[PDB]
Structure 1
Amino acid sequence: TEIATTSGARSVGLLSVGAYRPERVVTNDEICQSSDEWIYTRTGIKTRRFAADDESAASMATEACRRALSNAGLSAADIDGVIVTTNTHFLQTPPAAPMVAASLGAKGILGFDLSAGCAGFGYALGAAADMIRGGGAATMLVVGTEKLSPTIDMYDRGNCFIFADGAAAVVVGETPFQGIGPTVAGSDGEQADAIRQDIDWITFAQNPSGPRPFVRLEGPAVFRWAAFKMGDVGRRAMDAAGVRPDQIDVFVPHQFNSRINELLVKNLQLRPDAVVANDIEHTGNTSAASIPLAMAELLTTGAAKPGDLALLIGYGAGLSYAAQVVRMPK
């Protein structure tokens, strides 16, 4: 007997984006006591959001999902699955996805957590699109969520002003025309230490009164890697999608650093009038949540329009990257 195969939608796209940004604004001056100029010129950040003590990666993911569902004209009963992508869910288990599903009033739906630094969103988008086309699901939530503030060593003058909190979710479903291109992804596992938790939780657990773990970043190494490698990645994603650089309306790189992204814009040879995501300005670097948060900001302000041709490039920890061409959601 032959094992049967399911089939799903051919054309898949981003139906909606929904964003949750924590209430507390932390300015450059507040976090660093000419600090405002210093931080802004190096990173592009003016302010960022910090989540409250009672908030978590999962709780922000839930709020983002509620908003994404609303923008898609859907309820939780329309969703067949949810992928949470995060690096700041602070339990080995349970995973965030089932908790999020439950809070949404759809406790039974499939889901898992996906971790790949701030390439997680691209990987999760690709996985959702592949699952829907394979018939494993019809409509899915993909939410990038991050609570980075508790992981920051406020004495680490190399990164303390970089990381921030927030969540944003997209609805992926069948569309009239193809809305999501092939995923272009890869790694550099040899540079795994470039962005890291410096002390693993178990070594820490054997001596909790000694130094605790914090996020560490080898800035120059990441700058060099991102600025010199992601251009070729962007071109691969566009080639796979069958589009030219000059057909790109919107560029949404991961909001790691403005200077990096300015160099990527140049390398990718986009139109003079191409819209470039700059959400980092009042959001900072929110890792897995960055791209969908950046997408929401562009749509919220009317800088981008739904249906606009967008190039997304996620780069960051593990040294991991994931990129794809999409049409902008509602």
Structure 2
Amino acid sequence: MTEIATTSGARSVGLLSVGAYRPERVVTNDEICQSDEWIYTRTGIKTRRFAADDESAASMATEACRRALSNAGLSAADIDGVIVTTNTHFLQTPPAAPMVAASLGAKGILGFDLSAGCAGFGYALGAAADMIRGGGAATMLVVGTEKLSPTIDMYDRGNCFIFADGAAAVVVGETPFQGIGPTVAGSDGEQADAIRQDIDWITFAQNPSGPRPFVRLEGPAVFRWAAFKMGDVGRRAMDAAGVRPDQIDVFVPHQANSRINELLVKNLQLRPDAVVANDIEHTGNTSAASIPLAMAELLTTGAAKPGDLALLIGYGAGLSYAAQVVRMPK
């Protein structure tokens, strides 16, 4: 017999940088609601950004990657691979990743698209770290990108003010100390219909002049699942990384709803002075992009500092969750 060779990579892996792209167009509650107080009270959202018509999930991802590279002090030549996590790449094929790689001037590098609803970022982060420690790569881009605005039913009074557009990217590479803890993840396939495209594209393709697909949300069900189950997920993620709740400096949950996230902060028993991501206020829910965008906002404003111990929790569609403890990038 011949033994199949095993390779090895870096032991200590971390977030070198974050780079964010936010579309120019600002849509206020008052503009979209044709009550600002009503929306803000229920969601925590005041405004959100909508991408232009010529912008796409891939194009915003590219801009975000450019910015992440600059913040890590790297060129595209330094990158070994790129994972795009998104739910709004509106082509079955080709994937976004190779297009992103090409736009960045690194056309040959490995990459794929990963879809796990709002939790794809934690999954892609975990995969990158695993890949780098495995020896399959040394430095990687992970980019959450989302163009949700064309998917919104503007007569759906349950969700139309929730979803928004944007992209943010992290660079994952070797660090002097461990910077990304073990990935804690799971799902609940039994509640798959809680967040969905209501009509599959093929059913629609065969009757284009009938009702078209839009995003649908069973809000109460999602609220209850997130608010009550994600505490245990955070604890698992902290326990795996060997850290206590009181050691957490920064909490970055998925920016789905402020009320959900306030309940999680309380459930997680964090320090009274722990810094909690609240990017949703002017960014809305940008799904796969929300955590890294929220990371960027905290670093941009000086609320968080690079090296801060952060707990990230992603939750959402499919009913999927992914969580991990990290050190803040940049």
What CA distance in whole angstroms lies between the structure 1 residues aligned with 2:303 and 2:89? 32
Deviations 1:195-252 (A, max 9, x none): 0000000000000000000000000000000000000000000000000000000000
Question: 2:214 maps to which residue?
Answer: 214
- Deviation, 1:81, is 0.1
What CA distance in whole angstroms lies between the structure 2 residues aligned with 1:27 and 1:184? 36
- Deviation, 1:70, is 0.1
What CA distance in whole angstroms lies between the structure 1 residues aligned with 2:176 and 2:88? 36
Unaligned runs of 5+ residues in structure 1 are none
What CA distance in whole angstroms lies between the structure 2 residues aligned with 1:202 and 1:6? 43
- Deviation, 1:30, is 0.2
SS at match of 1:289: helix
Compute the TM-score of the two structures, normalised by the length of structure 2: 1.00
**1:299 is the counterpart of 2:278:** no
Question: 1:184 maps to which residue?
Answer: 184
SS at match of 1:323: strand
What CA distance in whole angstroms lies between the structure 1 residues aligned with 2:306 and 2:273? 17
What CA distance in whole angstroms lies between the structure 2 residues aligned with 1:233 and 1:272? 20
- Deviation, 1:157, is 0.2
- Deviation, 1:116, is 0.2
Question: 1:106 maps to which residue?
Answer: 106
Unaligned runs of 5+ residues in structure 2 are none
What CA distance in whole angstroms lies between the structure 1 residues aligned with 2:246 and 2:104? 40
- Deviation, 1:136, is 0.1
Deviations 1:64-117 (A, max 9, x none): 000000000000000000000000000000000000000000000000000000
What CA distance in whole angstroms lies between the structure 2 residues aligned with 1:75 and 1:192? 40
What CA distance in whole angstroms lies between the structure 1 residues aligned with 2:12 and 2:118? 26
What CA distance in whole angstroms lies between the structure 2 residues aligned with 1:245 and 1:182? 16
- Deviation, 1:44, is 0.1
SS at match of 2:172: strand
**Matched pairs, number:** 329
What CA distance in whole angstroms lies between the structure 2 residues aligned with 1:101 and 1:264? 36
SS at match of 1:169: strand
What CA distance in whole angstroms lies between the structure 2 residues aligned with 1:58 and 1:235? 34
Deviations 1:241-299 (A, max 9, x none): 00000000000000000000000000000000000000000000000000000000000
What CA distance in whole angstroms lies between the structure 2 residues aligned with 1:7 and 1:104? 27
What CA distance in whole angstroms lies between the structure 2 residues aligned with 1:208 and 1:88? 19
SS at match of 1:133: helix
What CA distance in whole angstroms lies between the structure 2 residues aligned with 1:170 and 1:249? 19
Question: 1:260 maps to which residue?
Answer: 260
- Deviation, 1:194, is 0.1
Question: 1:23 maps to which residue?
Answer: 24
Give the superposed CA RMSD: 0.2
What CA distance in whole angstroms lies between the structure 2 residues aligned with 1:208 and 1:292? 36
What CA distance in whole angstroms lies between the structure 1 residues aligned with 2:208 and 2:23? 29
What CA distance in whole angstroms lies between the structure 2 residues aligned with 1:180 and 1:69? 19
What CA distance in whole angstroms lies between the structure 2 residues aligned with 1:50 and 1:69? 24
What CA distance in whole angstroms lies between the structure 1 residues aligned with 2:73 and 2:207? 50
SS at match of 2:168: strand
- Deviation, 1:60, is 0.1
What CA distance in whole angstroms lies between the structure 1 residues aligned with 2:106 and 2:215? 34
- Deviation, 1:128, is 0.1
SS at match of 1:113: strand
What CA distance in whole angstroms lies between the structure 1 residues aligned with 2:256 and 2:181? 23
- Deviation, 1:316, is 0.1
- Deviation, 1:327, is 0.1
1:278-293 superposed matches below 5 A: 278-293=278-293
Identity among equivalent positions (%) equals: 100
What CA distance in whole angstroms lies between the structure 1 residues aligned with 2:281 and 2:259? 12
